[PDB]
């Protein structure tokens, strides 16, 4: 049982796509220049690695953007969990629009979408990728891992937020 993979992203060698330095940058709050376009400006997202697999990346077409919220979605987020299945992607910042004891003040959250089936490169890698993304996730708001699309569960996000003092996710919507 001897394997022999490459030597870079196999033991974790990613480096944020740079657009990730914008992922955290977005999904913030009223930062939306004007949220009527911001809604369609990419403000929620999942990411993974690269063509050869590296930089936190958009390995496909995941990504919510707050604007969709109300089309194929409606403000929660599990739809976004649906964006990420299990065989491909792990770090995701989704503009979290949720009230709290503080009230609706939007606070996105880091998503280590780590499915028990994803490829190794998106497990052994993220192990050290959460440091690279971190160097760009200056403020993650919510490092939240999920090895099941349920750890993302808004009710559970209503625990990561609704497990202390919010008002929605754990209160109004869930």
Swiss-Prot record:
Arranged from A to Z, the UniProt key words for this protein are: Acetylation, Actin-binding, Phosphoprotein, Ubl conjugation
* UniProt GO BP: actin filament depolymerization; actin filament fragmentation; actin filament severing; actin polymerization or depolymerization; cell motility; positive regulation of actin filament depolymerization
List residues of the ADF-H domain.
13-162
**Reported modifications of this chain:** ISGylated.
Kindly state the tissue distribution recorded for this protein.
Answer: Widely distributed in various tissues.
Q: Which residues carry this modification: Phosphoserine?
A: 12
* Residues the record lists as N6-acetyllysine modifications: 28
List, in alphabetical order, the Gene Ontology terms for molecular function in this entry.
actin filament binding
Q: List every position bearing N-acetylalanine.
A: 11
- What do the Gene Ontology cellular component annotations say? actin cytoskeleton; cortical actin cytoskeleton; cytoplasm; extracellular exosome; glutamatergic synapse; postsynapse; presynapse
> Where does the secretion signal sit in this chain?
none
Q: Where is this motif: Nuclear localization signal?
A: 39-43
Q: Report the SS bond pairs.
A: none
Which SMART domains does this chain map to?
ADF
**Entry keyword annotation includes Ubl conjugation:** yes
Indicate the segments annotated as coiled coil, or none if absent: none
Q: Which family does it belong to?
A: Belongs to the actin-binding proteins ADF family.
Q: What does this protein do?
A: Actin-depolymerizing protein. Severs actin filaments (F-actin) and binds to actin monomers (G-actin). Acts in a pH-independent manner.
Q: What is the protein name given in its UniProt record? A: Destrin
Q: Which organism is it from?
A: Homo sapiens (Human)
């Amino acid at each position: 049982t001897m394997i022999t993979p490459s030597s870079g992203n196999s033991a974790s060698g990613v480096q944020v796509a740079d657009e990730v330095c914008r992922i955290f940058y977005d999904m913030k709050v009223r930062k939306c220049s004007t949220p009527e376009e911001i809604k369609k400006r990419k403000k929620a997202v999942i990411f993974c690695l690269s063509a050869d697999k590296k930089c936190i990346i958009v390995e496909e077409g995941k990504e919510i953007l707050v604007g969709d919220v109300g089309v194929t979605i409606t403000d929660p987020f599990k739809h976004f969990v649906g964006m990420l299945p299990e065989k491909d992607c792990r770090y995701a910042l989704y503009d979290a629009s949720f009230e709290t004891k503080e009230s609706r003040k939007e606070e996105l959250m880091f998503f280590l979408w780590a499915p028990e089936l994803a490829p190794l490169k998106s497990k052994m890698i993220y192990a050290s990728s959460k440091d690279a993304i971190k160097k760009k996730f200056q403020g993650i708001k919510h490092e939240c891992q999920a090895n099941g699309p349920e750890d993302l569960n808004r009710a559970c996000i209503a625990e990561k937020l609704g497990g202390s003092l919010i008002v929605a996710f754990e209160g109004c919507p869930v």
